[PDB]
Design a protein around this motif. Structure first.
Motif, PDB file in Angstrom:
ATOM      1  N   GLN A 234      -4.646  -6.024  -3.082  1.00 21.81           N
ATOM      2  CA  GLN A 234      -5.173  -4.926  -3.959  1.00 21.81           C
ATOM      3  C   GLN A 234      -5.410  -5.440  -5.392  1.00 21.81           C
ATOM      4  N   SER A 235      -5.626  -6.747  -5.564  1.00 22.55           N
ATOM      5  CA  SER A 235      -5.840  -7.383  -6.888  1.00 22.55           C
ATOM      6  C   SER A 235      -6.881  -8.503  -6.781  1.00 22.55           C
TER       7      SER A 235
ATOM      8  N   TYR B 107       2.172   1.325  -3.521  1.00 19.90           N
ATOM      9  CA  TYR B 107       1.149   1.744  -4.520  1.00 19.90           C
ATOM     10  C   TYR B 107       1.137   3.280  -4.659  1.00 19.90           C
TER      11      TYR B 107
ATOM     12  N   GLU C  18      -6.301  -3.189  -9.726  1.00 21.06           N
ATOM     13  CA  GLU C  18      -5.937  -2.063  -8.811  1.00 21.06           C
ATOM     14  C   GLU C  18      -7.059  -1.728  -7.800  1.00 21.06           C
ATOM     15  N   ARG C  19      -8.321  -2.083  -8.053  1.00 21.12           N
ATOM     16  CA  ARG C  19      -9.452  -1.877  -7.086  1.00 21.12           C
ATOM     17  C   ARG C  19      -9.411  -0.440  -6.538  1.00 21.12           C
TER      18      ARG C  19
ATOM     19  N   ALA D  10       0.859  -1.228   0.000  1.00 18.70           N
ATOM     20  CA  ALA D  10       0.000   0.000   0.000  1.00 18.70           C
ATOM     21  C   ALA D  10       0.882   1.261   0.000  1.00 18.70           C
TER      22      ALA D  10
END
Ligand SMILES: N=C(NCCCN(CCNC(=O)NCc1ccccc1)C[C@H]1O[C@@H](n2cnc3c(N)ncnc32)[C@H](O)[C@@H]1O)NC1CCCC1
Ligand SMILES: N=C(NCCCN(CCNC(=O)NCc1ccccc1)C[C@H]1O[C@@H](n2cnc3c(N)ncnc32)[C@H](O)[C@@H]1O)NC1CCCC1
Ligand SMILES: [Ca+2]
Ligand SMILES: [Ca+2]
Ligand SMILES: [Ca+2]
Ligand SMILES: [Ca+2]
Lengths: 331, 331
Positions: free
Chosen positions: B301-302, B4, B121-122, B1
């Motif tokens: 996150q996928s 990202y 990527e949500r 995170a």
């Protein structure tokens, strides 16, 4: 950290690394020209990946080899140990070298802990930590590491950084003026170490050396690495930054074997690394370029690089803070 | 995170995205052909990056635009707002849309939350979460998303996966037999979605559509996405897997504008995505290929992608579990 062990979990990554001919052949030659140092010995293989170094240890007659691997690559090493008929001799231990149990101390630790510029990835800290398992007569393969620094001239690389940032000059990108960000963009490009190879003709002075002796050095020695340099300039021109490479030596009974990633040597997947100055320095042949490279370990498994240089004869000075976690792969 | 928001913190990433001509031009056209929907309105720009969509909102006459950005790209957006003389109209709010305060509800939310295959990527979950700030008469730009699936034939791609894995056949790689890992290596290559473009001539059936209506849909709708398909085969051959692309529609007062990443349309940086089957299916023209694509959100996150297909007329069946976090970029 879950990102680091996932990335080393991939057979495609192990394949790409094994296809480095210099890396694979040099380790085999180091271990097997020094086979008497392995004959009937106990071996710790730290971050073993697919287990190839454990197999080399076995080729050399080792009695027992503990192969420690923190990623899911461990379960693939186990498959090759069974299929090469070596379950009595190679023991794969899944986990971090810091958290696992070995039943006995070892004669020799083998590992491939070198990142870009040697220190990148800080798996060197795990190599040194593993010495808790090393008998006092024990060796380490590799034994020492040398980082080489030298000043370079490369106006094409320098100018390429401005060219990339000139996207941001557009006063009407879809009716938006981007130009107030051009400087920030230049800045960010210059903060990236450049990973590729170059012709030695671009070096302006003979390299300076910083040695790490893996037998003597301790984990904490690597939180802060200070590399002072005085270069005797052999050429007159703009100095655009510092070039880095490294050598490791496997110091056995029979033979010392060198793995070199120098630009005079055959190419490896470590390439070489260049850090640009914000602003180039004019130096004449005969001048001295003096200053410090400083590596400060950050809590992101990497290093902040500080470089300060000054031409003693003019006092023209230049610096950069670079981020070894955002390299530019120019190759 | 932290990985990202660092990656989206880079002006080089914003530049690469802004150089997608279809992406930039389509958003400008959507917002400005529908300028009456922005005239004197209040706007929330979710994951604004450099702030370009906020500027488009301003070009359209918006009274106030809240530009929310969780990465250090926020401080660069702020620089462009000051330099384009819009501090009274664009307010940059550093932080996650989930954790920040807005003083008033908005007429319209704008965003670019589409990943590869739309859901990657949500950041879609953050787009839907932002609706808490939306007046009940409010619109969303974009308004709907369509994912397209179709079966494909591509023996070159299929065989390329075996060729890569054949490194592991070597019975003497430096005296080590690698062959017991060939299967695991094949497996791992087949678990990678392939990101590149292809000629529509490789599609064997007309696409099926799965629609997300961003106005109505809620965060939880995207933890588990189920895409059943029945394909009427138009060609006879091996079906090697499923191809994916997406369309989003900006549904304004004046005009509906489509951003399409279909293989018939001009190339974008989303390319298209293919997931191979472990084993291809023979289908004749006239057969039906039926099954399910399932996307399950993982705490990385996928999405885990499950694909099951069966030729109804033969019962020949094939599956794969793919990992949208380890794409292969073949372009
Ligand atoms: N070399 C690198 N990076 C260096 C680090 C890689 N490293 C060595 C790979 N082991 C390898 O290929 N061995 C076979 C080999 C070796 C030499 C020659 C032939 C074959 C990373 C490995 O250590 C692991 N790890 C990290 N922290 C810990 C820990 N605490 N405890 C235990 N394991 C840990 C990781 O999961 C992983 O398996 N990059 C490229 C540049 C060009 C060459 C390749
Ligand atoms: N498009 C993608 N990925 C989609 C996501 C990117 N996204 C949009 C980039 N915003 C952008 O370029 N805008 C200008 C623009 C837009 C359209 C046209 C021209 C200019 C990621 C952005 O949201 C941020 N973020 C993530 N989670 C949260 C959060 N909770 N709260 C707040 N911000 C959050 C991030 O830090 C980041 O700034 N990849 C490439 C494929 C081809 C095209 C580009
Ligand atoms: Ca062997
Ligand atoms: Ca324009
Ligand atoms: Ca404007
Ligand atoms: Ca060989």
């Amino acid at each position: 950290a879950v990102q680091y062990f996932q990335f080393y979990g991939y057979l495609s990554q192990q394949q790409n690394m094994m296809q480095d001919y210099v890396r694979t052949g040099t380790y085999q030659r180091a271990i097997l020209q020094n086979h008497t140092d392995f004959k009937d010995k106990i071996v710790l293989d730290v971050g073993c990946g697919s287990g190839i170094l454990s197999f080399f240890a076995a080729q050399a007659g080792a009695r027992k080899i503990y192969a420690v691997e923190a990623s899911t690559m461990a379960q693939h090493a186990e498959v090759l140990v069974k299929s090469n008929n070596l379950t009595d001799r190679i023991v794969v231990i899944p986990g971090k070298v810091e958290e696992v149990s070995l039943p006995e101390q070892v004669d020799i630790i083998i590992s491939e802990p070198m990142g870009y510029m040697l220190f990148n990835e800080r798996m060197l800290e795990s190599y040194l930590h593993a010495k808790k398992y090393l008998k006092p007569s024990g060796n380490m393969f590799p034994t020492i590491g040398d980082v080489h620094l030298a000043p370079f001239t490369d106006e094409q690389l320098y100018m390429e950084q401005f060219t990339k940032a000139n996207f941001w000059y557009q006063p009407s990108f879809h009716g938006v003026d981007l130009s107030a960000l051009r400087g920030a963009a230049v800045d960010e490009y210059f903060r990236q170490p450049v990973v590729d190879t170059f012709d030695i003709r671009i070096l302006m002075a003979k390299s300076v050396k910083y040695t790490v002796n893996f037998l003597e050095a301790k984990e904490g020695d690597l939180h802060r690495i200070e590399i002072p340099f005085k270069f005797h300039m052999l050429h007159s021109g703009l100095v655009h930054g510092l070039a880095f490479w490294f050598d490791v030596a496997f110091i056995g009974s029979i033979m010392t074997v060198w793995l070199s990633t120098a630009p005079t040597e055959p190419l490896t997947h470590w390439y070489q690394v260049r850090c640009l100055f914000q602003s180039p320095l004019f130096a004449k042949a005969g001048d001295t370029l003096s200053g410090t490279c400083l590596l400060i370990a950050n809590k992101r498994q990497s290093y902040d690089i500080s470089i300060v240089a000054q031409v003693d004869q003019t006092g023209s000075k230049s610096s950069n803070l670079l981020d070894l976690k955002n390299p530019f792969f120019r190759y």
